[PDB]
Amino acid sequence: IYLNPPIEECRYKLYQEMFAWKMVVLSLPRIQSQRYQVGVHYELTEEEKFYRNALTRMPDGPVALEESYSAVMGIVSEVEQYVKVWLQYQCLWDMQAENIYNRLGEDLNKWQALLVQIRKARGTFDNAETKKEFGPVVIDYGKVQS
Amino acid sequence: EEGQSLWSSILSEVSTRARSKLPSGKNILVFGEDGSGKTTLMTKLQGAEHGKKGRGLEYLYLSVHDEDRDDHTRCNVWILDGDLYHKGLLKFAVSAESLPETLVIFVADMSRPWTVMESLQKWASVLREHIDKMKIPPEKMRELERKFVKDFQDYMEPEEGCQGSPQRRGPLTSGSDEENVALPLGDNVLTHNLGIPVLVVCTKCDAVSVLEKEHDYRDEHLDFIQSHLRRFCLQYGAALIYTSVKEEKNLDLLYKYIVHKTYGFHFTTPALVVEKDAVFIPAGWDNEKKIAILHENFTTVKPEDAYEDFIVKPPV
Numbered sequence: 001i002y003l004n005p006p007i008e009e010c011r012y013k014l015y016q017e018m019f020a021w022k023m024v025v026l027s028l029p030r031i032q033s034q035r036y037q038v039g040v041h042y043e044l045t046e047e048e049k050f051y052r053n054a055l056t057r058m059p060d061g062p063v064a065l066e067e068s069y070s071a072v073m074g075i076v077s078e079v080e081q082y083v084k085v086w087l088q089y090q091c092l093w094d095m096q097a098e099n100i101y102n103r104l105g106e107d108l109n110k111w112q113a114l115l116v117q118i119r120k121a122r123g124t125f126d127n128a129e130t131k132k133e134f135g136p137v138v139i140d141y142g143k144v145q146s
Numbered sequence: 147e148e149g150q151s152l153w154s155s156i157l158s159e160v161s162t163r164a165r166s167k168l169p170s171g172k173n174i175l176v177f178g179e180d181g182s183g184k185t186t187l188m189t190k191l192q193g194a195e196h197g198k199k200g201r202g203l204e205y206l207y208l209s210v211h212d213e214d215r216d217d218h219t220r221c222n223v224w225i226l227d228g229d230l231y232h233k234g235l236l237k238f239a240v241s242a243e244s245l246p247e248t249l250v251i252f253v254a255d256m257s258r259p260w261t262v263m264e265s266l267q268k269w270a271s272v273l274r275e276h277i278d279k280m281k282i283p284p285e286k287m288r289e290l291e292r293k294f295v296k297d298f299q300d301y302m303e304p305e306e307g308c309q310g311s312p313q314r315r316g317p318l319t320s321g322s323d324e325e326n327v328a329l330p331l332g333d334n335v336l337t338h339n340l341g342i343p344v345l346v347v348c349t350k351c352d353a354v355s356v357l358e359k360e361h362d363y364r365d366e367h368l369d370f371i372q373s374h375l376r377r378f379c380l381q382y383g384a385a386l387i388y389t390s391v392k393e394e395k396n397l398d399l400l401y402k403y404i405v406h407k408t409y410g411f412h413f414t415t416p417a418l419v420v421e422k423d424a425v426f427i428p429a430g431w432d433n434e435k436k437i438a439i440l441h442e443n444f445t446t447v448k449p450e451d452a453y454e455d456f457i458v459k460p461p462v
Contacts, residue, residue: 008207008220015205019198026201045181055201055232062232069203069238091157094164099156113149 001090001144003083010079010137014072026052078134086141165215168409171247172221173240174208177269178253179261180228182349183391188225190397191404202227203235210405221408228265233272242282245342246290249407252346254375256388256423257353260459263374266346270338270382277340290341294383298336301430302326304416312412329433334377343407343429344384346375351423352390361458366447368422369440370456373449376427376437386427395424 005013030051032040040048047053058065104110130142176184185204189197192206204225211218224239226232240248252269254262282290300315302308315326329335357363379386387403389395399415406413418426441449447456 006220008222011222012205012207015200016198019200022200052201056229062234065202065232066234066238069235073238088157090164091161094160096160096163099160099163103152103156110149110152114153117149117153 001087001093003087007076007080007083011072011076014075014137018068018072022055026050026055075135075137079137079139082132082134082139086144165217167215167217168210168212168219169247170219170221171244172219172408173244173248174221174223174404175236175239175248175250176223176225176253177250177273178226178228178347178349179255179258179265182253182255182257184225184253184349187349187389187391187394187397187400188223190394191401192223202229202232203238208401208404230268230272236276237280240280242280245280245282247408248342249404250342250344252344252384254346254348255350256348257350259354259357259371260454260457262371263378263453266375266378270378273340274338287341291339292341294339294341295336298383298430299328300326301428303428303431304414306416308412309414309416327430327433329380329430330435332434333381334434334437335380336383337381339381339383341383344379344382345403345407345429346379346384346386348386348388350391351388351395352393354423363457364446365422366444367457368425369443370447370449370451371453372425372427373437373440374453376432377434379427379429380432380434383429385429388424388426390423 028051029049030053032048034040100114104114125145130140130145132139132141176188178184185199186196188206189195191208193209197204197206204223204227206223206225207220208223209218210221222239224236226236226239250273252266254266297315302313302315304313354368375386385403385407387400389400396415399413402411402415403413405411415426417428417431418424
């Protein structure tokens with residue numbers, strides 16, 4: 001049981017619409033304060049070509065960048081919790097029958113109650129949802145539920 | 147609840163009996179200055195050339211695919227800027243649980259070698275107020291430092307027979323305590339060691355080759371910088387890599403040292419000394435007598451010159 005694309009790519013994707021949504025503003029060019037001269041048509045940085053110091057000129061402090069990034073870490077934490085809901089159940093594909101069967105022995109009520117548990121847990125694993133969304137962010141898990 | 151706790155103990159023990167993965171949740175910090183190809187080589191360690199270069203807390207991931215058990219984790223990348231107004235983004239980078247899951251990388255720019263040590267002790271001071279503010283309990287913090295003293299003394303430089311299989315820096319003769327590298331302790335040695343794997347990377351060491359001819363330096367210029375670097379990295383327990391960003395000098399060496407320091411793997415290369423913009427300085431290898439070995443090579447200079455004046459900063 002595995003997630004593709006993983007949690008690092010999910011965080012990377014949220015940081016990609018960070019990057020596109022911040023280079024709405026940052027990839028705007030800034031204007032040379034004289035233009036018809038020669039010396040600023042010599043080599044410039046991104047802080048001399050583009051308006052990228054307006055991110056350094058946040059007037060209320062940097063506070064909404066940590067608010068957005070904490071929203072990213074909270075969303076990554078919640079989808080990380082739901083992907084390690086279903087990564088808990090890789091134990092059935094790690095399952096060796098000897099660790100069950102030498103533990104149970106021949107006491108029949110353990111086998112009967114275990115068949116009750118596999119029926120009850122298969123009742124839980126046949127539920128209606130195949131895709132879980134937090135905010136916009138979607139897990140696909142329907143194929144692995146089947 | 148006999149069979150339920152029995153079966154829950156079975157599901158705890160069965161996933162223990164499976165194949166081990168690299169433990170995820172690892173973070174990698176980039177300290178240092180902008181304009182140095184932090185994003186560039188950090189994408190090279192990801193597997194790319196250049197990424198979507200933002201600013202502040204840039205994120206990537208390193209594709210750490212295992213070659214032994216053939217698994218793949220990806221560890222977190224937090225490229226911090228040169229700005230100290232957006233330096234407050236590091237609480238999403240590293241916490242105290244994942245502070246042992248952290249390989250700290252410092253950028254030294256060798257395109258701007260004159261601004262190195264003030265940025266080093268400034269970002270190290272940032273890291274010190276950071277490491278005071280993140281509030282580790284001090285018994286585990288001193289446990290990390292005492293075991294870092296332990297693995298610091300465990301190190302050997304690799305031989306030709308240690309460029310394959312892992313060099314046994316633990317017990318070769320089993321169940322004992324013997325010295326491997328015994329450091330002469332000074333005030334440049336481990337006095338603000340933090341108990342974590344720390345690294346400083348010299349970036350753009352092909353821009354030294356500008357200043358070997360367009361500034362016309364000598365051999366004792368790099369030993370001045372390098373002895374100051376040895377004094378400060380040995381004070382925090384670190385290694386030192388001399389890299390060119392643009393020519394991409396020995397990326398696999400870097401990746402082997404990253405997986406070697408994070409998950410206890412092997413870094414399969416000896417400490418290079420032979421090319422002056424590619425001198426490898428490990429952790430637990432160099433000491434203050436080795437700093438004085440550069441002073442044997444000090445023929446025309448004494449080490450008490452100024453940092454921007456001996457290593458000539460142009461006023462722009």
